[PDB]
Design a protein around this ligand. Structure first.
Ligand code: FAD
Ligand code: FAD
Ligand code: LMT
Ligand code: LMT
Ligand code: H2S
Ligand code: H2S
Ligand code: H2S
Ligand code: H2S
Ligand code: H2S
Ligand code: H2S
Ligand code: H2S
Ligand code: H2S
Ligand code: H2S
Ligand code: H2S
Lengths: 421, 421
């Protein structure tokens, strides 16, 4: 309302949950902050691959949101938004209620576009997914069904995927778990299928020696690997795969039987967001300026996977670049600062800063991690690392992030760089 | 929500508007206060009779609510509540949206029960009303239509009415206005019909010499007056009146032609409130204890005309006792204090205090006013007064109340008793 602007944060995930806390901290008691989300619980997404193989439980990685944000003065609505009217500034919720806003921060993350590949939906066939804890629990269930009745495995990433690390991670920990169960010798074939132009491209044109290390890792585990692949359909428990060359010409088609499968899908914008006329690119991603402000609506900001980031290369099979945690938090921090500035006269000048990708994957006793910045080579930092200490760091950061999500955040975030001082 | 209770005030009138301000003042920034009302504007009800004869305009007595309450941190919803679910603690609004509450203060005032008398609705016949500015504007319109085409006048109060002062006031100022227009001699008959057992009973068994003074005033103006009357129907521009004796036996029936009429209707509780199972008496009035708390729902409080107050006498024709401004404000003050106490552990002990009725009527250059307390005789104060100074006081208080409704209130209210100190 006038003088007491109402700020709504849409989506309670990696970006939106911190956004809610930071917004409330920044605005104070004279402004209403409402967090709206489809689920009533927060989940730590990077832990999902482990849920998918049974090394972790939902209880370990998820928790109910209400109490933690309410004790901070944040209103929580656990309903999905179905429609956004950007002119009227109303959000229509699944239950039919409407919520008005003065400022809206979109942090709705990705729509998992299973529909790109007929039959690929986890509920339609044997190809599962581990992007959400719901799906990872289901993937694990189906993994247990593979144990009771061994058959071919196919793991990888679909055309248009932007999140490749987890596919390699999941394949490695499955291979590992199979060994630790003396079941590995029971698998007739274990195949890795990716839309990447080469192993370890990772949607970022490789990082450090990702190519060599991931290639060797796959071979070490007896996983046969194909690149430049798209899946045209999943049907009758078979994946129909087309493999192309540098020019997009088919060089083979394959029909792969699948008893147990997991393919990272392409991401699009969620329907409620993509449905806002003029707000998004054709993929459903919100077009924002460097200050995280919508180019169309001055009172709509966005952060996280939900925003559009222009490609910098074109691969034989369409692929995207990942949007990862540190950059997401910088987007969030910039949006909150620039909204506050709008509320107080100024134009906020804060940006998300330099593009970067940072990923940590835990294999059990040790992990792999990379840091890449900026997006195009030659880079200022281009490191891939493997060690027991990556594992320790992943474990540490998970514990930390979950704690902060319960206790609240403010100021910036991360800056766990107190391990220097 | 937990730790930050949400308080909703239903109705933005004489009680509810101050309730919103006082609630927000009392609770502070850590609690949401939402004011919900059917109209987007406040109106000063006691001024309506003057609107009804054209001595005042809507612009003089009403103003839009939003800006004034919002600048105080109060959320304003200009929608009628249609349904209240006291179990779920949800209010369904006219537009279909729902509002949840932790505490609800009902200040919905009266439903004007025109349906008690078939044909009496201001839109169904010549019998108008002046309880709301919408209706008083309409009454005035019809008054102008009487000027252009003189015919019999009938003014008064229906069976079950509880608000008699305004009927006498309106009759006097009409008689007066007719004179000031040289139109008085054009009226074939001017009749006063009341459910009171005698002139000046006023629903409170008389006050001071109200009987004598009002009787004389009516005769002075050539107004013929009947008591112990109920109107059974209005039809074909005639009022069908039945007059009874002390025992309820008919002593005559009358059929009165009406060119211009105004009868104060009986009040009931509004449907959304009356519709709450177990909340109200059969009249639709909220049953509350001395702390203004609902006897059924510990988190519902009520103030103003909306609450039930037991009768203390029974008249040949049903009548009720008025609920007037000073007592309403005491109810409001008690409810706010006791809600705050609930929020902070204690049980609030504040009550509305002694029953009283206080009314001021302006006739033009001078006014009449009464004060009566407590409800049953013999009283501690039982005064009726007439003078130029009542007029000056009415004018002063109207200006004051409207100003306070724009600038906000807190602490108690009234206590304009600084004219002593
Ligand atoms: C398997 C996997 C592993 C990953 N590992 C890493 C990693 O190790 N390091 C790293 O930096 N990044 C990693 N990421 C990427 C990124 O950090 C996560 O995807 C992160 O969760 C993205 O944050 P987000 O806020 O944009 O979206 P999300 O965390 O997905 O949150 C979006 C929220 O919006 C809600 N929502 C969606 N639609 C609606 C709607 N219509 N109405 C209301 N709410 C809605 C969703 O329920 C969700 O709560 C990983 C991603 C995946 C999929
Ligand atoms: C003609 C007249 C003259 C009077 N003169 C005096 C006087 O001189 N002195 C005195 O002390 N008292 C006087 N009174 C009596 C009393 O003070 C007023 O009636 C006063 O307005 C009552 O206050 P209230 O808050 O209970 O109800 P109201 O002032 O009627 O307010 C009720 C509010 O609730 C709203 N509402 C109703 N239903 C809903 C719904 N379902 N959802 C949302 N909102 C709803 C209404 O729009 C209204 O805004 C007079 C009354 C009348 C009718
Ligand atoms: C985080 C994003 C990346 C994607 C997800 C994860 C992919 C899975 C990782 C596969 C790597 C496994 O293969 C592993 O690689 C490194 C080589 O560099 C080897 O390790 C070698 O370098 C490390 C240090 O980095 C030394 O400590 C070690 O003594 C040496 O042998 C391991 O002997 C080999 O087993
Ligand atoms: C407020 C609630 C009451 C209901 C609404 C109003 C009803 C209308 C009022 C009718 C009274 C008119 O009648 C009027 O009464 C008083 C008598 O007491 C007279 O006034 C008499 O007493 C007053 C003081 O009170 C003296 O100042 C005056 O000199 C004296 O004549 C007026 O000469 C007479 O004209
Ligand atoms: S998923
Ligand atoms: S990712
Ligand atoms: S990734
Ligand atoms: S990642
Ligand atoms: S590079
Ligand atoms: S009315
Ligand atoms: S009244
Ligand atoms: S009255
Ligand atoms: S009154
Ligand atoms: S009395």
């Amino acid at each position: 309302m006038r003088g007491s602007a109402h700020v709504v944060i849409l989506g309670a995930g990696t970006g939106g949950m911190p956004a809610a806390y930071e917004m409330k901290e920044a605005l104070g008691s004279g402004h209403e902050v409402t967090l709206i989300s489809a689920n009533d619980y927060f989940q730590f997404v990077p832990s999902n691959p482990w849920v998918g193989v049974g090394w972790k439980e939902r209880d370990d990685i998820a928790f109910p949101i209400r109490h933690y944000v309410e004790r901070k003065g944040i209103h929580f609505i656990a309903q999905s938004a179905e429609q956004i009217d950007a002119e009227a500034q109303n959000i229509t919720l699944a239950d039919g209620n409407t919520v008005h806003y003065d400022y809206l921060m979109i942090a709705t993350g990705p729509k998992l576009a299973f529909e790109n590949v007929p039959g690929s939906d986890p509920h339609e066939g044997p190809v599962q997914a581990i992007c959400t804890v719901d799906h990872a629990e289901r993937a694990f269930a189906e993994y247990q069904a593979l144990l009771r009745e061994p058959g071919p495995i196919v793991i990888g990433a679909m055309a248009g995927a932007s999140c490749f690390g987890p596919a390699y991670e999941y394949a490695m920990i499955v291979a590992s778990d199979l060994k630790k169960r003396g079941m590995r010798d029971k698998i007739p074939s274990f195949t890795f299928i990716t839309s990447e132009p080469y192993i370890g491209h990772l949607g970022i044109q490789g990082v450090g020696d990702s190519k060599g290390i991931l290639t060797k890792g796959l071979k070490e585990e007896g996983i046969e690997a194909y690149t430049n692949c798209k899946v045209t359909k999943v049907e009758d428990n078979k994946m129909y795969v087309t493999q192309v060359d540098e020019k997009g010409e088919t060089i083979k088609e394959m029909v792969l039987p699948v008893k147990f499968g997991m393919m990272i899908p392409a991401f699009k914008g969620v329907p409620a967001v993509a449905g806002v006329e003029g707000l998004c690119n054709p993929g459903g991603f919100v077009l924002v300026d460097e200050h995280q402000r919508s180019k169309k609506y001055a009172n709509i900001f966005a952060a996280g996977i939900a925003i559009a980031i222009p490609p910098v290369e074109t691969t034989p099979v369409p692929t995207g670049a990942p949007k990862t945690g540190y950059m997401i938090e910088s987007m969030v921090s910039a949006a909150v600062h620039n909204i506050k500035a709008d509320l107080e006269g100024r134009k906020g000048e804060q940006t998300m800063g330099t593009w970067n990708a940072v990923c940590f994957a835990d294999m059990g006793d040790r992990g792999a991690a990379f840091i890449a910045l900026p997006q195009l080579k030659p880079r200022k930092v281009d490191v891939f690392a493997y060690g027991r200490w990556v594992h320790l760091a992943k474990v540490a950061f998970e514990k930390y992030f979950i704690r902060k999500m319960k206790m609240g955040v403010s100021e910036p975030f991360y800056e766990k760089v107190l391990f220097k001082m």
